[PDB]
Design a protein around this ligand. Structure first.
Ligand SMILES: NC(=O)c1ccc[n+]([C@@H]2O[C@H](COP(=O)([O-])OP(=O)(O)OC[C@H]3O[C@@H](n4cnc5c(N)ncnc54)[C@H](O)[C@@H]3O)[C@@H](O)[C@H]2O)c1
Ligand SMILES: NC(=O)c1ccc[n+]([C@@H]2O[C@H](COP(=O)([O-])OP(=O)(O)OC[C@H]3O[C@@H](n4cnc5c(N)ncnc54)[C@H](O)[C@@H]3O)[C@@H](O)[C@H]2O)c1
Ligand SMILES: [Cl-]
Ligand SMILES: [Cl-]
Ligand SMILES: [Cl-]
Ligand SMILES: [Cl-]
Ligand SMILES: [Cl-]
Ligand SMILES: [Cl-]
Ligand SMILES: [Cl-]
Ligand code: NA
Lengths: 352, 360
């Protein structure tokens, strides 16, 4: 009772296992008893889910070790990366070591990049534990760390050997974090799959109730969508941009409200609404299409209104090309949208 | 006169251009006006070749910037890597920036790793200015930086868009560094190609006189050989490139930071490996002598350091590497042009080889 997606990358092809109680199936890890595994997680996730993974490794017969990094985006740095390197080196780990990234997107990116650079690359397995990481970190191979002068500017494209997603870990995930992740779930429906959007409209209640079947289906379809978006980009470099719906306006909110105030997903929600209205003002979608987009984000308990104290100037400050929906299920990168239209989109969204 | 070698790696195929006066040909860079370009070099090489390169960028119309890292292996660290990230970020460079690595192997590896990680990968052009970097770094995709607990343990496989080798730059390379480079050129002859070894014996003096034709052929041949070894390793054979490194690292570790150049330790290491091979019957006496003779002709050290005992070698080759008696593993020549990885070489044979090399 679980779905499995296979990301096509030839030699790098891997499986994404998504289901309930998966942390009990040792065969999803694909490891031999001779392999030495190192679980890298943070101080919060460790006591919660490390034990399940640790028991999974003992059944197989693997020799293991645990490394707990400090919890927080402020620690997604080169220094913490170095902590992973130092650890791997002081315990004499070879290029055959298998690294398991157990945690949210912060751990996924940092440990993934750590895995990419150690002796020029060692196998790693993702075990995302936030809704956002499960639907975004699982595909694309992006890994990174921050620099004082810039976020996610140091990194690499590195694929995992496997990705294990047990929908049960979401139960301990804080309400806001879960909602923040729905922003991304909803995004896929808007930009690429009309049928999936309609399904989301009907199953929101069930998703927020943490219905097993609904979660599994939702996460699985997001991973497929992103996998196809990325597969196309290798043929014609351009469609992967579509994944940035709402990020332009969103980034401006986060940047202005101070990082950590608004979660990224909440900022993406309001940005998506602003993008949709911009689309409507440009004639790319109609009134009722906008209303369906607005209504679903509201149903997902996400912010949809322009922040009370952000002026149009504040947005331009961080904004100065946009991803706009062209219907519910289709989108496009639109170039040359007049400031006036953007301004009116921003102002209009104070009424939603 | 110019040789061009295409390194075949599918979508990531790149050209290696080798010749005299290549720094006067802007076409070799494949750049465009207004394209952002950054030259990363060190304080020593900058005043010798940055102006030439900057001249090409100005001709083309590129907006450029220069980063001068400190000269030294001690600086090939993750923090210096961070300094390149900082430099790139303070200039607000996008993924369209082109990074030029101008210098020896230290710059090649570090800037290469920088190019690999900045915004997850930007284009970099490699302009190796030492003989060793020209014949060992131009092919292989290896980039890395050191960690206090391990040399070259943090890095990535990242291919350059192009490699430009202007043989004129060897004119300013210190005699010692040039010779260290030759230890690697000779390496290729010993382990993979008999004809090239013979050719090296015949033209060694021309090479030291910095003959343009000789330099171009020698460096082009080394790049071709490595390109084959590497492509053949994807299908093991690449490990044969470590001829002498075991004995070599023992010398480097014992003698201390930057006392002996890597190529120097490799040369004496190669002679010890060759002798060990002779005693095991893997090569004959005359073959050992041609190896000894060509390394001396290249003005390289070929003897066991006088102040270093057998026990000294063993503490590094065995004790520190957790290699117990009967477990030594060494790449040994099996003739002039072939080699193999040999294990279980008795310590008594290595012991006498080390002793015999005190007076070769
Ligand atoms: N690589 C990619 O393609 C990609 C995509 C999207 C986001 N990201 C990155 O991901 C990061 C954000 O990820 P995030 O949103 O998961 O934040 P996060 O990783 O900080 O996780 C949020 C918080 O929840 C805790 N947590 C995680 N799982 C939990 C659980 N099951 N129960 C209770 N608490 C739990 C963590 O300790 C953390 O405090 C950003 O740095 C972003 O750049 C990367
Ligand atoms: N990536 C690979 O496959 C590979 C292969 C072999 C070595 N390496 C690395 O290369 C590094 C050693 O490289 P190296 O031997 O070139 O040392 P290096 O890069 O330190 O150069 C030696 C010295 O020559 C100076 N120099 C360079 N070009 C000069 C010139 N034209 N004129 C005057 N001075 C010049 C440098 O400033 C330096 O002082 C090591 O860290 C090693 O790990 C990498
Ligand atoms: Cl432990
Ligand atoms: Cl934080
Ligand atoms: Cl508000
Ligand atoms: Cl400058
Ligand atoms: Cl000199
Ligand atoms: Cl060694
Ligand atoms: Cl003999
Ligand atoms: Na032989």
């Amino acid at each position: 009772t679980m779905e499995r997606i296979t990301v096509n990358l030839g030699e790098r092809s891997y499986p994404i296992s998504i289901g309930a109680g998966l942390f009990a199936n040792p065969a999803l890890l694909s490891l031999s008893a001779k392999q030495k595994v190192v679980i890298v997680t943070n101080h919060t996730v460790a006591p919660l889910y490390a034990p399940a993974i640790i028991s999974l490794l003992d059944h197989i017969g693997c020799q293991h070790a645990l490394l707990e990094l400090p919890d927080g985006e402020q620690y997604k740095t080169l220094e913490t990366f170095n902590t992973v390197m130092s650890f791997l080196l002081e315990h004499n780990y070879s290029r055959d070591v298998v690294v398991i990234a157990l945690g949210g997107g912060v751990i996924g990116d940092l440990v993934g990049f750590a895995a990419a650079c150690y002796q020029r690359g060692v196998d790693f397995i993702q075990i995302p534990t936030t809704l956002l990481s499960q639907v975004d970190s699982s595909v694309g191979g992006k890994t990174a760390v921050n620099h004082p002068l810039g976020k996610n500017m140091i990194g690499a494209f590195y694929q995992p050997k496997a990705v294990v997603i047990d929908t049960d870990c979401l139960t301990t995930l804080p309400a806001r974090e879960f909602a923040a992740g729905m922003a991304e779930v909803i995004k896929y429906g808007i930009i690429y799959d009309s049928a999936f959007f309609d399904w989301l409209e009907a199953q929101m209640e069930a998703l927020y109730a943490l219905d097993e079947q609904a979660l599994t289906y939702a996460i699985a379809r997001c991973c497929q969508i992103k996998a196809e978006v990325v597969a196309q980009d290798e043929k014609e470099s351009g469609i992967r941009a579509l994944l940035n719906l709402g990020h332009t306006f969103g980034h401006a909110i986060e940047a202005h409200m101070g990082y950590g105030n608004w979660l990224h997903g909440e900022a993406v929600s309001a940005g998506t609404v602003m993008a949709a209205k911009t689309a409507q003002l440009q004639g790319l979608i109609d009134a009722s299409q906008f209303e369906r987009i607005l209504a679903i984000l509201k149903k997902a308990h996400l912010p949809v209104r322009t922040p009370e104290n952000m002026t149009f100037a504040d947005f331009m400050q961080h904004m100065m090309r946009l991803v706009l929906p062209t219907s519910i299920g289709t989108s496009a990168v639109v170039k040359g949208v007049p400031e006036a239209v953007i301004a009116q989109a921003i102002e209009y969204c104070r009424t939603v």
